[model samples]
Target: GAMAPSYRVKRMDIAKNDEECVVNAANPRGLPGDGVCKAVYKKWPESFKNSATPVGTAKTVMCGTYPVIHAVGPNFSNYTESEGDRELAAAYREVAKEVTRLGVNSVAIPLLSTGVYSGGKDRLTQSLNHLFTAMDSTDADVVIYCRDKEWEKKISEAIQMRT
Candidate 1:
């Protein structure tokens, strides 16, 4: 039988995973300057650099087993009030759609807009809600990767609220 859709929160180094696809919160300008993007750039500099471009909202680049899906999140300037919420939701939706299209059985994504974008806890909660809601029906084994226990708790709470 097909595995039922599942969502889990975990704390770990996202860069350590090469068996599954990883999503990076990027910008439309194709700069991997901060947060997980920096890690990605460091890991596969040539691949990310060669393929990086200000193309679209969602861009997928293959880096060995870890096919990085770059979902351009909101800019730091826009991470305010309701604008951040809408931007993050759009980014998560795009990532979900791309991952499903790629037929990736396992995927890990961070809470968008929370890093260099300057998003706060409330923003994290809202963005997690959007990401999980969009991926709830997908068959992929989605993992919401958190940097710490606090973010993990926030994600868990968001998932509970959504369900």
Candidate 2:
């Protein structure tokens, strides 16, 4: 089974995902208010609060039924134009590594840094590219959730470029 295609990118709502885990972007503070972090916090507030910290690159918190990989991506402020790309890429890679370490089979990942990280189209493209490439070596089934048609198209293009 591991010999086959290992990953995929898709457009869907990650909140309703049934995968073994869901990946979201976070601040080191672990404060959840907007985006997927809000959903995760709503689902498992105690776990999110306990596992989250104000000083880490990434951490995994156990949700009600599955785990959430909370990656502290670039801060919205104090970032250069090119910094968001690197931050998102690093976050994605860290999430991939966490999933593999936890023996998770399937995971749904949001576009890290592109949301509250204040990244744009170019950053989105670069993030997806780095994410897909990082997960390519893992046996886990990866699903990337895109919120809109433009993102869907971008993710599709990135996947096409990977193949």
Candidate 3:
């Protein structure tokens, strides 16, 4: 089966204007914080009930606008190369499965963690690597969104990776 999704980056608010299901880099508790989750959570408090997805998994939750796939990525504080790497990839795999289950034509996933959860750009690069690798295993118009120009450039550059 030739199942390759249109994976790309976009400069936009991931939650507001997209037609596809927006992916929220949620916490283990699925609670809101100061990152993009806060922006996503702030939109609809009512839609966010029972929103708990553990790290390395994705959960579908009723949300403010368009369906939301709440995915919890690993917090790489004690960064173990062998294990943390697997956790990062596992989260995206779960997300890809979630998208297939929901049968969504498209999905928007941010570079998960790398917020207060993940403390550096280095982790972000690894997370992006896992994201594309995981998304490559499935099909959907996967849009990676960020609210910053620099981030858009980083994401844009990530897509330029070659084998």
Candidate 4:
């Protein structure tokens, strides 16, 4: 099928005001119980409960906004090398799938594995490579809003090389 060019790569902070529908990478724990999740849950507890999803095989809960689907991989510190990579891509794909299914024109993402996983340049670069490669075929605009210049540079380089 012919899909529209509706994806982009940018920062989450900047997207906050856009009516374009915001997306973010959440821990899925629904723990720490503050920030976005806490506010969302407080505002819409029932909805949050209904939308909650499991983290890996554990009981910890995670969820995303209606138009924003969040995916959680195994605990960042745990997982075999190969398995970790697989899970990271799987998480991104799950959310991307939700983006398409929800008919959103655009979605935002943070540096996934780089966060809690904290893998350095090589591993983080590889993770982004896999995530964006899978996203290239989708109709929705994909915006990756990284935290800072260093991260932005890393992601920019990754997208350039693969494209």
Q: The CA-based lDDT of model 4 is what?
A: 0.54
Residue-wise lDDT of candidate 4 within 1-163, one digit each (tens)?
1255543455445325242444334456544243444433453343344344544211212334434444555445767767777777777667666656666666555556665554433455766776676677776666676556676777777667755
Off by over 4 Å in 2: 1-3, 53-56, 119-122
List TM-score per model, in order.
0.83, 0.83, 0.85, 0.70
Between candidates 1 and 3, the one scoring higher on TM-score is: 3
Give the winner by TM-score: 1 or 4.
1
Better of 1 and 3 by lDDT: 3
lDDT of each: 0.71, 0.70, 0.76, 0.54
Give the alpha carbon lDDT tens digit for every residue of 1-163 in model 3: 1255566788877766464677788888867766778878887555468779778888888665567788888777765666767887899989888888777778878888767767454565788888877778676777887777887887787777652
Local accuracy of candidate 1 as per-residue lDDT tens digits, 50-141: 54433225788887655788887776565565766676677777787888888888887887777767643446756677787677777888
How many pairs collide in each candidate, listed in order?
0, 0, 0, 7
Q: How would the candidate models be sorted by TM-score, starting from the highest?
A: 3, 2, 1, 4
The lDDT of model 1 is 0.71
Cα error, candidate 1, residue 50 (Å): 5.4
Measured by TM-score, the strongest candidate is 3
